[PDB]
C-alpha cells in the first residue's frame, strides 16, 4: 500500500510503484508564511501552479567509483521555469520542496543510495585553510560531486547523517525516494541568490554491482517547490 504513490502538483504528476513511505522533514509540512511571523510588509506574489510543480534535473550516471552528488536549493532551480523568473525578479523568497529521486535497475543489481536532505550544509575544503569560493558552492542545475562523502565534505560523518531527513534507495526494495521539505531558515524569507536552505545529497553507501549485462543506471532528481512566496519586486539581475 505504501509502495504505490502518485504525487500531483500543478500540471506535473509522478506515479511510482516501488517506493517507500515518504519522509516529511522533522514531521513538518510546508505552508505559506502566516501574518504573525511575517516581516516584509508588501503583498507577496503566490504564483502557485506556475511554480509549485515538479522540476526534473539532469540525470547523473551511477557508475563504478561514484562518490556522490549534491544539489543546493533553491540554487538548483533559480534558472528553471517560472520559478526561476520569480526568483530573478524578486528580492525575497520562501518555499518548501518536494524532492523525488528516481533510480531503478534489474533484480540482479545491488546497491544502496543514501538520499539525504541537509539543512545549511556549509561545506569545507580539503587540506587547506582557505574557504570554498563562490564557484565551488553555487553550481546551479548540474550540482556537484562529493569529494570525501565519508565525512560529508565538512569534517563530520556520513554514519551520523541519518539525523537529517533522509530515505534510502536499496535496489532490492525500492526504486524511488521522496522527501517533503518545509521552509528551514532563521529568517522568514530570504534572498535566494546568496543562500541555500537545503542540500539534497545522494551518496553511494553500497556501490552498484551485478553480473548481468551492463546497462547505464541513471539517478534522476525531480524537485517540486511548495508554497512559494516572493516579495520585493524589482527588475531582473
Amino acid at each position: 500500500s505504501d509502495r504505490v504513490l502518485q504525487l500531483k502538483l500543478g500540471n506535473s504528476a509522478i506515479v511510482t510503484q516501488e517506493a517507500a513511505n515518504y519522509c516529511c522533514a522533522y514531521g513538518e509540512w510546508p505552508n505559506y508564511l502566516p501574518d504573525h511571523e511575517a516581516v516584509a510588509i508588501d503583498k507577496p506574489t503566490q504564483p502557485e501552479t506556475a511554480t509549485d510543480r515538479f522540476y526534473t534535473l539532469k540525470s547523473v550516471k551511477w557508475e563504478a567509483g561514484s562518490t556522490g552528488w549534491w544539489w543546493k536549493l533553491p540554487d538548483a532551480l533559480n534558472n528553471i521555469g517560472m520559478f526561476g523568473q520569480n526568483v530573478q525578479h524578486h528580492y525575497l523568497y520562501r518555499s518548501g520542496f518536494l524532492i523525488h529521486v528516481q533510480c531503478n535497475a534489474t533484480r540482479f543489481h545491488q546497491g544502496a543510495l543514501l538520499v539525504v536532505a541537509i539543512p545549511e550544509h556549509q561545506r569545507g575544503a580539503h587540506n587547506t585553510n582557505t574557504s570554498p569560493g563562490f564557484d565551488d558552492i553555487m553550481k546551479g542545475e548540474e550540482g556537484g560531486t562529493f569529494n570525501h562523502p565519508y565525512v560529508l565534505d565538512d569534517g563530520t560523518s556520513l554514519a551520523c547523517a541519518t539525523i537529517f531527513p533522509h530515505q534510502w534507495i536499496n535496489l532490492r526494495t525500492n526504486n524511488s525516494a521522496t522527501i517533503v521539505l518545509p521552509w528551514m531558515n532563521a529568517a522568514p524569507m530570504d534572498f535566494p541568490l546568496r543562500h541555500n536552505q537545503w542540500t539534497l545529497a545522494i551518496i553511494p553507501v553500497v556501490p552498484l554491482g551485478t553480473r548481468t549485462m551492463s546497462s547505464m543506471v541513471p539517478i534522476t532528481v525531480s524537485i517540486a517547490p511548495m508554497c512559494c512566496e516572493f516579495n520585493g519586486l524589482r527588475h531582473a539581475i
Partner: protein
C-alpha cells in the same frame, strides 16, 4: 528632515540641501539617486532619522521620502520616484527602475 542629496563638490553649504532639475531634450532621463545606507555617510546621515539611528545598531520599519517642488507656479512637470529592493546594481534607465 532634509536630505543632502546634493552631497557633491561645488555644492557649498545650503546648496547641498536641494536638487536642481532643468528642462531636458531627451526622454526617460535620470535626475538623481539616493543611497539608502543609514550607517554610511550618505544623504541620510544628517537627518533626524539618520542621527538617532546611529546611536543604535539594528533597525526595522518603513521610511518615507517626501519631496517638495520649489519651482514657480508656472512650472509644470512629472517625475517618477522609484524604490528598488536590493540584489543587483542601481537601475540607470527608467525601463529598469519602474519595475
Amino acid at each position: 528632515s532634509m536630505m543632502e542629496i546634493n552631497n557633491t563638490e561645488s555644492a557649498v553649504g545650503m546648496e547641498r540641501l536641494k536638487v536642481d532639475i532643468s528642462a531636458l531634450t531627451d526622454v526617460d532621463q535620470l535626475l538623481f539617486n539616493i543611497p539608502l545606507d543609514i550607517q554610511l555617510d550618505g544623504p541620510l546621515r544628517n537627518t533626524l532619522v539618520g542621527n538617532i539611528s546611529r546611536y543604535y545598531t539594528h533597525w526595522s520599519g518603513s521610511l518615507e521620502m517626501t519631496f517638495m517642488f520649489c519651482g514657480s507656479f508656472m512650472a509644470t512637470g512629472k517625475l517618477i520616484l522609484c524604490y528598488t529592493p536590493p540584489g543587483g546594481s542601481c537601475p540607470t534607465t527608467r525601463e529598469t527602475a519602474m519595475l
